[PDB]
Each structure stands twice: as C-alpha cells, then as structure tokens.
Enzyme design. Structure first.
Site, PDB file in Angstrom:
ATOM      1  N   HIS A  28       0.768   0.729 -13.134  1.00  0.00           N
ATOM      2  CA  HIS A  28       1.487  -0.447 -13.538  1.00  0.00           C
ATOM      3  C   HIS A  28       2.998  -0.154 -13.693  1.00  0.00           C
ATOM      4  O   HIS A  28       3.526   0.819 -14.471  1.00  0.00           O
ATOM      5  CB  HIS A  28       1.227  -0.832 -14.979  1.00  0.00           C
ATOM      6  N   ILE A  43      -7.443  -9.689 -11.700  1.00  0.00           N
ATOM      7  CA  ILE A  43      -7.851  -8.913 -13.106  1.00  0.00           C
ATOM      8  C   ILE A  43      -9.373  -9.014 -12.943  1.00  0.00           C
ATOM      9  O   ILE A  43     -10.172 -10.004 -12.255  1.00  0.00           O
ATOM     10  CB  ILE A  43      -7.424 -10.015 -14.129  1.00  0.00           C
ATOM     11  N   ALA A  66      -9.271  -0.643 -19.003  1.00  0.00           N
ATOM     12  CA  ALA A  66      -9.932  -1.271 -20.171  1.00  0.00           C
ATOM     13  C   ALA A  66     -10.108  -2.700 -19.765  1.00  0.00           C
ATOM     14  O   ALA A  66      -9.325  -3.292 -19.003  1.00  0.00           O
ATOM     15  CB  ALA A  66      -9.396  -0.891 -21.393  1.00  0.00           C
ATOM     16  N   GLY A  76       0.742  -1.235   0.003  1.00  0.00           N
ATOM     17  CA  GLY A  76       0.087   0.026  -0.068  1.00  0.00           C
ATOM     18  C   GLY A  76       0.788   1.518   0.064  1.00  0.00           C
ATOM     19  O   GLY A  76       0.329   2.244   0.432  1.00  0.00           O
TER      20      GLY A  76
HETATM   21  N1  LIG Z   1      -9.969  -6.008 -17.353  1.00  0.00           N
HETATM   22  C1  LIG Z   1      -8.927  -5.365 -16.618  1.00  0.00           C
HETATM   23  N2  LIG Z   1      -8.534  -5.887 -15.211  1.00  0.00           N
HETATM   24  C2  LIG Z   1      -7.382  -5.214 -14.637  1.00  0.00           C
HETATM   25  S1  LIG Z   1      -6.980  -5.466 -12.908  1.00  0.00           S
HETATM   26  C3  LIG Z   1      -5.521  -4.293 -13.116  1.00  0.00           C
HETATM   27  C4  LIG Z   1      -4.463  -4.437 -11.953  1.00  0.00           C
HETATM   28  C5  LIG Z   1      -3.718  -5.350 -11.926  1.00  0.00           C
HETATM   29  C6  LIG Z   1      -2.995  -6.180 -13.167  1.00  0.00           C
HETATM   30  C7  LIG Z   1      -2.697  -7.278 -13.268  1.00  0.00           C
HETATM   31  C8  LIG Z   1      -1.916  -7.282 -14.248  1.00  0.00           C
HETATM   32  S2  LIG Z   1      -1.270  -9.295 -14.282  1.00  0.00           S
HETATM   33  C9  LIG Z   1      -2.473  -9.784 -13.081  1.00  0.00           C
HETATM   34  C10 LIG Z   1      -2.580 -10.964 -12.679  1.00  0.00           C
HETATM   35  O1  LIG Z   1      -1.960 -12.065 -13.209  1.00  0.00           O
HETATM   36  N3  LIG Z   1      -3.498 -11.310 -11.682  1.00  0.00           N
HETATM   37  C11 LIG Z   1      -3.552 -12.620 -11.233  1.00  0.00           C
HETATM   38  C12 LIG Z   1      -3.527 -12.978  -9.719  1.00  0.00           C
HETATM   39  C13 LIG Z   1      -2.234 -12.744  -9.234  1.00  0.00           C
HETATM   40  C14 LIG Z   1      -1.594 -12.043  -7.820  1.00  0.00           C
HETATM   41  O2  LIG Z   1      -2.658 -12.181  -7.091  1.00  0.00           O
HETATM   42  O3  LIG Z   1      -0.560 -11.510  -7.648  1.00  0.00           O
HETATM   43  C15 LIG Z   1      -5.346 -13.273 -11.644  1.00  0.00           C
HETATM   44  O4  LIG Z   1      -6.128 -12.023 -11.439  1.00  0.00           O
HETATM   45  O5  LIG Z   1      -5.566 -14.443 -11.786  1.00  0.00           O
HETATM   46  C16 LIG Z   1      -2.894  -8.628 -12.705  1.00  0.00           C
HETATM   47  C17 LIG Z   1      -5.609  -4.001 -14.317  1.00  0.00           C
HETATM   48  C18 LIG Z   1      -6.570  -4.405 -15.245  1.00  0.00           C
HETATM   49  C19 LIG Z   1      -6.872  -3.894 -16.719  1.00  0.00           C
HETATM   50  O6  LIG Z   1      -6.012  -3.309 -17.335  1.00  0.00           O
HETATM   51  N4  LIG Z   1      -7.982  -4.710 -17.185  1.00  0.00           N
HETATM   52  N1  LIG Z   2       0.058  -5.095 -12.333  1.00  0.00           N
HETATM   53  C1  LIG Z   2       0.027  -4.232 -11.523  1.00  0.00           C
HETATM   54  C2  LIG Z   2       1.445  -4.059 -10.356  1.00  0.00           C
HETATM   55  O1  LIG Z   2       2.352  -4.936 -10.631  1.00  0.00           O
HETATM   56  N2  LIG Z   2       1.408  -3.211  -9.232  1.00  0.00           N
HETATM   57  C3  LIG Z   2       2.434  -2.861  -8.822  1.00  0.00           C
HETATM   58  O2  LIG Z   2       2.666  -3.501  -7.425  1.00  0.00           O
HETATM   59  C4  LIG Z   2       3.266  -2.508  -6.430  1.00  0.00           C
HETATM   60  C5  LIG Z   2       2.351  -2.249  -5.398  1.00  0.00           C
HETATM   61  O3  LIG Z   2       3.031  -1.553  -4.391  1.00  0.00           O
HETATM   62  P1  LIG Z   2       2.254  -0.907  -3.151  1.00  0.00           P
HETATM   63  O4  LIG Z   2       1.091  -2.098  -2.646  1.00  0.00           O
HETATM   64  O5  LIG Z   2       3.168  -0.351  -2.193  1.00  0.00           O
HETATM   65  O6  LIG Z   2       1.411   0.126  -3.729  1.00  0.00           O
HETATM   66  C6  LIG Z   2       3.501  -1.165  -7.189  1.00  0.00           C
HETATM   67  O7  LIG Z   2       4.628  -1.260  -7.830  1.00  0.00           O
HETATM   68  C7  LIG Z   2       2.375  -1.440  -8.440  1.00  0.00           C
HETATM   69  O8  LIG Z   2       2.653  -0.706  -9.666  1.00  0.00           O
END
Ligand SMILES: Nc1nc2sc(CCCc3csc(C(=O)N[C@@H](CCC(=O)O)C(=O)O)c3)cc2c(=O)[nH]1
Ligand SMILES: NCC(=O)N[C@@H]1O[C@H](COP(=O)([O-])[O-])[C@@H](O)[C@H]1O
Length: 200
Positions: free
Chosen positions: A108, A91, A140, A11
C-alpha cells in the site's frame, strides 16, 4: 514457499518480486500471476519471465465471492502457499480473506494507518505531509488494516505530483515488498496466535 502474485495493472511490484525471488537465497518462488484485467503490462512482465498467467475478469462474475472463488481455484491448482497483492485493486471477500489469513500480503503506497484507500498519493498531497511511504501488511478483512510487516518512509518534495511522488514511493515499494515476502516465506515472520506480527 509457493507464491501467487495478483496484479491489476503495470506490474512494477511484480517485476521487483520476480527479480528478488530468483536470487539463490530466496525462500519464495512465484508460480502464478493472476490479473483481473487483460492486456495489462504486468502480464507481459510475467510472460517474459516464464511465469504462468491467468486473467480472471471480475466484471464477468455475479458478486465478490464468485470472483474470489475463481481466484481460489487457480491458487489451489498451483498449490499456492502465499498470495501477494501487487497493485491488485479489487477488494476481497471475507471468506477468501479468512481462508488466506496470515498467507496474504498487500503493498500500500502510504504509511498506514494514514491514507487508506485507492488514492493514497492524492490524499497525502492534499493533506500536505512532508513524509509519506509504503506499507506491506497482511491482508485482513478490514481494508488496509491488517498487521503491518514492513514500512519505509519516502520524503515528499515541494512541487510533487502523483506522478513524481508515486515514482519515488515505488522505489521504496520495490525494496520492502521483496523483503516482506522473504520474511514471510522463510517463516521468519508470521501472523501470531495473538494476531499481531510474530517474529519467530
Ligand atoms: N478484505 C480486504 N481486501 C483487500 S484487497 C487489497 C488490495 C487493494 C486495496 C484497495 C484499497 S481501496 C480499493 C478499491 O477501491 N477497489 C475498488 C476497485 C477500484 C479499482 O479497480 O481501481 C473495488 O474493489 O470496488 C482497493 C487490500 C485488501 C484488504 O486489506 N482487505
Ligand atoms: N491500494 C493499493 C494500491 O494503491 N496499490 C498501488 O498501486 C501501484 C501498482 O503499481 P504496479 O502495478 O507497478 O505494481 C503500487 O504503488 C501499489 O502500492
């Protein structure tokens, strides 16, 4: 503008958003912090800041839309205008993203479109870039492909690891993501009718 900050972990981005939105000139107010994981330090940062917190454990839900609907309920409850994903790692489903189209921001840790996905720093180091950075974009449906609001480049130093590179990138993250929230909350930037960034 009323803001929900969705977190999954430490956070530090939340903390930067808290600090900025308490500045007198801030156009955004943080009214709720939603974590999909309990006992993450971001909840303590919000609690120390007086901000309500809700934990919505994604593992207790059947699929993604049931999990997202649970979030949407808290968002309506707090009359949220803008959603910030600050280290939130789940996601989001299509219908949720469509509902919040133009009202949802993600931070990101790369210069999108490079190194989409969950381990941008690992990919950056593996690729051997000497410049990386961070991106604030509108969310998006296509992950890490929404319209870009702000970016800031961050040098990669020889010898960098995920630890040292993400620490340097987070310094930039904590600048552009408050700035990006202010742009959107003030109505200075919006997702235009043509879907690209509109500086109105
Ligand atoms: N529609 C849409 N949803 C989202 S959520 C988001 C912020 C996070 C981006 C992300 C990039 S890889 C990953 C991912 O792999 N999530 C996994 C869980 C892994 C973990 O817990 O560390 C999963 O969901 O299965 C999340 C951006 C975004 C977007 O731009 N478009
Ligand atoms: N795909 C998005 C991603 O990788 N998120 C990244 O996780 C970190 C969270 O730090 P925080 O919990 O200290 O803000 C941040 O570097 C953020 O950009």
């Amino acid at each position: 503008a009323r803001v929900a900050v969705l977190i999954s972990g430490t956070g530090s981005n939340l903390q930067a958003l808290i600090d900025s939105t308490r500045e007198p000139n801030s156009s955004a107010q943080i009214d709720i912090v939603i974590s999909n994981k309990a006992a993450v330090a971001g909840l303590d940062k919000a609690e120390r800041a007086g901000i309500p917190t809700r934990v919505i454990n994604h593992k207790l839900y059947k699929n993604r839309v049931e999990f997202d609907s649970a979030i949407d309920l808290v968002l309506e409850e707090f009359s949220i205008d803008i959603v910030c994903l600050a280290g939130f790692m789940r996601i989001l489903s299509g219908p949720f993203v469509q509902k919040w189209n133009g009202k949802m921001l993600n931070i990101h840790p790369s210069l999108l479109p490079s190194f989409k996905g969950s381990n941008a720093h690992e990919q950056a180091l593996e690729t051997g870039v000497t410049v990386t950075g961070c991106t604030v974009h509108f969310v998006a449906e296509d992950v890490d492909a929404g319209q870009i609001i702000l970016q800031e480049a961050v040098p990669v130093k020889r010898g960098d690891t995920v630890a040292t590179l993400s620490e340097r990138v987070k310094l930039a993250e904590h600048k552009i993501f408050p700035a990006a929230l202010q742009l959107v909350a003030s109505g200075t930037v919006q997702l235009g009718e043509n879907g690209k960034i509109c500086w109105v």
